[PDB]
Design a protein around this ligand. Structure first.
Ligand SMILES: [Cl-]
Ligand SMILES: [Cl-]
Ligand SMILES: [Cl-]
Ligand SMILES: [Mg+2]
Ligand SMILES: [Mg+2]
Ligand SMILES: [Mg+2]
Ligand SMILES: [Mg+2]
Ligand SMILES: [Mg+2]
Ligand SMILES: [Mg+2]
Ligand SMILES: [Mg+2]
Ligand SMILES: [Mg+2]
Ligand SMILES: [Mg+2]
Ligand SMILES: [Mg+2]
Ligand SMILES: [Mg+2]
Ligand SMILES: [Mg+2]
Ligand SMILES: [Mg+2]
Ligand SMILES: [Mg+2]
Ligand SMILES: [Mg+2]
Ligand code: NA
Ligand code: NA
Ligand code: NA
Ligand code: NA
Ligand code: NA
Ligand code: NA
Ligand code: NA
Ligand code: NA
Ligand code: NA
Ligand code: NA
Ligand code: NA
Ligand code: NA
Ligand code: NA
Ligand code: NA
Ligand code: NA
Ligand code: NA
Ligand code: NA
Ligand code: NA
Ligand code: NA
Ligand code: NA
Ligand code: NA
Lengths: 119, 145, 246, 115
RNA sequence: UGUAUGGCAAGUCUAACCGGAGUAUCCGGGGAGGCACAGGGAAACCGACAUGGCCGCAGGGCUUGCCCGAGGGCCGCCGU
RNA sequence: UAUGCCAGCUGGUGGAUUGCUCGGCUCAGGCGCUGAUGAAGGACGUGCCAAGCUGCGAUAAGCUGUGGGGAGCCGCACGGAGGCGAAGAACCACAGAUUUCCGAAUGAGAAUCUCUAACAAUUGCUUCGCGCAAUGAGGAACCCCGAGAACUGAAACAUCUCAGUAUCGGGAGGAACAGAAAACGCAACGUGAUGUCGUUAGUAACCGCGAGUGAACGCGAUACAGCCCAAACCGAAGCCCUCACGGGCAAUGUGGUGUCAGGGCUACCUCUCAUCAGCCGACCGUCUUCACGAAGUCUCUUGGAAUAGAGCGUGAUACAGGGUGACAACCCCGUACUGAAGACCAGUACGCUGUGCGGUAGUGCCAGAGUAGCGGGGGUUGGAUAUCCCUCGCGAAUAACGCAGGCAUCGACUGCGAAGGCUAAACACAACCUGAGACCGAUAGUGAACAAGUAGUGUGAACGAACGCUGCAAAGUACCCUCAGAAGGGAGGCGAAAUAGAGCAUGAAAUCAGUUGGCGAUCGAGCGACAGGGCAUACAAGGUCCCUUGACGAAUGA
């Protein structure tokens, strides 16, 4: 709807399969040109470049994608706990850009290429 | 700024002693209570007066004074011009749900008028004939006797 | 008077007589009344629950225990207006008539007057609109009604030295106050009104601050947003014509 | 507190005249228009016909309405006229706005106030 | 029932509702009906001064006290 | 100078304030019945570890199929262990499987268990056998039929009023009810089923003629729709169960005809496009859901972070709303445009099949009885003589008759056929879906933003709270010292910030600890206002002030 409370609500309570659209990131210029899409659903295989946080400028491989929290783990984008363990600093796909896609899934590549569907 | 808007701080809001604006006792009773006792003043006296005739036995006449006709004879260019001649029935509004159209004699008549209506007043004729005019009575108007 | 017609390039292409209505003496008081009414008439009825605070059998113990005669249940005061969780003494009510009447003659007169305020470069500039021009309203050929791209309308407006107004309206304001929580976070200046004849300009409507209307039903709010007369407007050859008999 | 911006100006103009020129009627009309609308004049033709005289401008400190008949050739000046009034008048004379009268006759001479 | 402001004015206003649309706003239509346009009388029934006279405020005129004097005041006269 | 007074500072207590909104409140559109095929509700179960909530039912946070969806997932719930998913899981839609016990609860009994084949009970049909069926109970209110107060108003009070209200009994549906004139009665050469809306009108009418109460016809609208029996005349030509056989019903009449454009019968004229039964069966629209969907994440500065400032650029049938480390059309979801599906409209409209409409003359063949109507007693209504109803008693005609038109009787005139029946659409509500807001913003708004009808109180009926906010990211504090110590403390680490460190944003007042200034153990109490002195004071936001002399100089005045 147009009411803020309902907007935020539908986004926070959206069922798992609708959570997919929440983890979409913009595609690089080449990839945009190559597949006819402005963005894509970030996957655990894709390579990405950080465009906004304190890690802006760094690239890495998407190590994890949580649909529930709508966040991703990017290789080397970490935080150092007190004990010394290096843990991941979650990122919002909105501040990220896909530079390389993992296309081992026939289905993903298919959708990624059809002109009538978006991946 | 209105009177209402200036009450905050007044405590009593114009009612005088705070012992005043309580219940109906402050009004001498609910509604017209005591209209025959403590508040009889300005109330019409008690009692019955007269009788009414049943609604469907009552006639309602559609009336108009000569003054109205006469003042607009020229303006009534959409009505017969003779040596004027007008059928009141077509002039008086509310002449449908009316039991009949009657011409009254209020004002002057500065034209020779030939008026046709269901009824006329003595003075309506006197004035219309005195101005060199005639008064034609409708067939309905043929109830005079 | 006469109004210069412009072609989709911004060049003069004849000119017709500016209908008489644009000579109606500007009447801001009447215009304001018409706009205040239109705004009130779309307001929604509201009010608290008829029974809020009354769902309780709370009673006053009366005298004897050194307590005020306040209704209480399970040791807590209730129902009365001075009590927490108590009823609201004189709350908003659904039954209230939040609408405003306006005589058709009075409203029609304000429409005509707002129309007239449109053909006054000084008024229009005072109202706040930004533009470099002398003739106003800005009249255009009926071919405007066939444009399709917003970008196209932009150029035309730049060619008419009237695009500055849209630059003015290209800045939303984030309002102070809780309107925000109810979906009224933003607000922006009113820019150009585009009156056409067949249908509202699909091509111009998205322009920042713009409003599109049709001569048969363009209204007071259209001509004088917020009751303020003199909106920078652009009529259509045929629009200008229809408006005359309003 | 008048609301009509036009009525306001008219009143300010009626004064400026009363003060500058010698017009006393103008200041008189201004003082009446300033008073509550309910006190303003609502005159029908029949009354103008009865007390107006040629070459003497009829000044109505209110509005002229169309009831009755007017035969005299007089120049009536009012704040406003009902469409019918203005029409019947111009057929035998001239209907004029106080704003015009103030200009044609700032001295407010040869005028008769009618309410 | 008053009052202030505003529209229209011997009239004025639409109600439900209908069409349009930018779709609760808004534009157009809708006068059903209401109040006003005549009253008096229980009723039957009957049915009035678009001005005849005098004072006179404001305002106007004049040859500077003298005229014309809306409104207002006092009478006449008219309907029942 | 103790005890101590006033103001402040540092720290606390407290949780106001400001900001925020996962909740409310209200309006609007759509849609709307469930249950013996055992509902709704409840009990008890069910997870690797499981207390609450949610889901589910011994196949127990689930099983199957089809479609969608997609590289993740194992509910809220972020642990530990482990597992599932390219054999396409998660998740969503439709359909199906399973679905304990109590519960209308129905074999019988019982505080959710138990005892020895069950429609218990009441009915209809009936193979007279529970063989085939029905009813029961629920639901937010709405709806219909019954029973029916009082406080109160009348400034007391009895009729009246509150009010046919509250509450109670019985029951239907998605809507109910009403409904094709024994009407109306602008009286007419007129209207033409019924609801409802606007008006008629606070009119007529009622009334200790007090207070108060209070229509209708008509009109303008919405939506429109009109039919079936009983009887006459026919007289088994009929209907139900069953695949069939066969059985049951039916002369106390199944079935044909017929229903005030009266019909039937007899004799003719003409014709059907009415009506009724049945078949087929939507468009559009509306509501919801879905697919697709344009353009910057470029420079410098600031910052922990750019959705900021300055600069450059772009889309727009899209500048609604939301998200994202700060103000984002162009970063992500969306939004405009186009398209798809489902539901409702509706088994309706249109179309079709079948039947056959109507007219003339003749005929006293037929046409609903405790009725119409009268009287006694009450209730109810605006209903007054003239509302509607109940009760007791009495009681008619037969169309050549009867009822009505606001007192009764008789005549005239006009209208209309009661005592049998059915009937779409327009209207009410708001459970359910979705949308909206000059509504509230955590003492508000629902009782309930939180475990909310929760905790808790009462034998019970019933009653009933409070509690929202770390951070951009848990980076949720390693190591060392101390200690009885997973306490606490010290030191230290993270972060822009820990005085953001866990009921953790901000953090008021009352008030408490410490401390600074002033006062202070010989002195008097509305705590101050106005004057004037002491002492005290970083900046900033105020910059004036003191003395000699001189000028001016009201009243007054040596
Ligand atoms: Cl009478
Ligand atoms: Cl007059
Ligand atoms: Cl009728
Ligand atoms: Mg593709
Ligand atoms: Mg409350
Ligand atoms: Mg504020
Ligand atoms: Mg009429
Ligand atoms: Mg049992
Ligand atoms: Mg009493
Ligand atoms: Mg009903
Ligand atoms: Mg009394
Ligand atoms: Mg009553
Ligand atoms: Mg009636
Ligand atoms: Mg039959
Ligand atoms: Mg009663
Ligand atoms: Mg609360
Ligand atoms: Mg007890
Ligand atoms: Mg805090
Ligand atoms: Na007072
Ligand atoms: Na008081
Ligand atoms: Na009283
Ligand atoms: Na008395
Ligand atoms: Na009529
Ligand atoms: Na309660
Ligand atoms: Na106390
Ligand atoms: Na309302
Ligand atoms: Na009318
Ligand atoms: Na529904
Ligand atoms: Na659990
Ligand atoms: Na189940
Ligand atoms: Na059964
Ligand atoms: Na049996
Ligand atoms: Na009393
Ligand atoms: Na008493
Ligand atoms: Na009584
Ligand atoms: Na972002
Ligand atoms: Na009786
Ligand atoms: Na009748
Ligand atoms: Na709270």
């Amino acid at each position: 709807s147009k009411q803020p409370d309902k907007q935020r609500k539908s986004q926070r309570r959206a069922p798992l399969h609708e959570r997919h659209k929440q983890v979409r990131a913009t595609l690089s210029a080449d990839l945009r040109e190559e597949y006819g899409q402005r963005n894509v659903r970030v996957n655990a295989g894709d390579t990405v470049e950080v465009l906004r946080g304190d890690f802006a400028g760094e690239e890495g491989e998407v190590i994890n994608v949580d649909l529930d929290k709508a966040v991703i783990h990017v290789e080397d984008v970490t935080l150092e706990k007190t004990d010394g363990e290096e843990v991941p600093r979650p990122l919002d796909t909105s501040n990220v850009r896909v530079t390389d896609l993992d296309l081992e899934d026939e289905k993903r590549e298919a959708r990624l290429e059809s002109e009538d569907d978006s991946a | 700024t209105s009177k209402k808007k200036r009450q905050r701080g007044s405590r009593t809001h114009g009612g005088g002693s705070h012992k005043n604006r309580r219940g109906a006792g402050h009004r001498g009773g609910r509604g017209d209570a005591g209209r025959d006792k403590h508040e009889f003043h300005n109330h019409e006296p008690l009692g019955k007066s007269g009788f009414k005739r049943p609604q469907k036995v009552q006639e309602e006449a559609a009336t108009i004074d000569v003054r109205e006709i006469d003042e607009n004879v020229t303006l009534l260019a959409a009505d017969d011009v003779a040596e004027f001649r007008v059928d009141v029935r077509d002039v008086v509004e509310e002449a449908d749900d009316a039991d009949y159209v009657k011409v009254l004699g209020a004002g002057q008549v500065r034209h020779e008028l030939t008026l046709i209506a269901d009824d006329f007043s003595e003075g309506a004729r006197e004035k219309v004939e005195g101005a060199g005019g005639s008064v034609e009575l409708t067939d309905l108007g043929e109830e005079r006797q | 008077m006469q109004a210069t017609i412009y072609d989709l390039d911004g060049n003069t292409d004849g000119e017709v007589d500016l209908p008489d209505v644009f000579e109606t003496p500007v009447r801001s008081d009447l215009i304001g009344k018409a706009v205040r009414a239109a705004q009130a008439n779309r307001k929604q009825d509201y009010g608290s629950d008829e029974y809020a605070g009354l769902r309780t059998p709370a009673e006053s113990f009366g005298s004897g225990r050194g307590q005020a005669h306040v209704p209480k249940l399970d040791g807590r005061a209730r129902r009365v207006p001075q009590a927490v969780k108590g009823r609201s003494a004189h709350p908003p009510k659904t039954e209230k008539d939040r609408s405003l009447d306006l005589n058709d003659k009075e409203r029609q007169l304000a429409v005509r007057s707002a129309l007239a305020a449109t053909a006054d470069a000084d008024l229009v500039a005072d109202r706040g609109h930004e533009f470099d021009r002398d003739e106003v309203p800005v009249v255009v050929s009926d071919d405007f009604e066939d444009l399709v791209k917003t970008q196209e309308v932009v150029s035309l407006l730049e060619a008419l030295d009237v695009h500055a107004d849209i630059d003015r309206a290209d800045e939303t304001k984030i309002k102070a106050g809780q309107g925000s929580a109810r979906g009224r976070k933003y607000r922006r200046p009113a820019s150009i009104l585009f009156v056409t004849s067949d249908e509202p300009s699909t091509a111009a409507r998205n322009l920042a601050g713009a409003d599109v209307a049709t001569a048969s039903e363009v209204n007071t709010e259209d001509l004088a947003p917020g009751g303020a007369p003199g909106r920078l407007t652009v009529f259509t050859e045929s629009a200008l014509a229809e408006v005359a008999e309003r | 507190s008048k609301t009509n911006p036009r009525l306001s100006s008219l009143i300010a103009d009626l004064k400026s005249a009363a003060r500058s020129s010698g017009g006393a009627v103008w200041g008189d009309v201004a003082e009446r228009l300033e008073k509550p609308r309910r006190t303003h004049a609502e005159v029908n033709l029949g009354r103008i016909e009865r007390y107006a005289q040629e070459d003497e401008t009829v000044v109505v400190p209110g509005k002229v309405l169309g009831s009755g008949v007017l035969q005299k050739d007089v120049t009536v000046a009012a704040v406003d006229f009902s469409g019918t009034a203005e029409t019947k008048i111009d057929q035998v004379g001239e209907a004029v706005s106080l704003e015009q009268a103030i200009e044609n006759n700032p001295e407010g001479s040869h005028v008769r106030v009618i309410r």
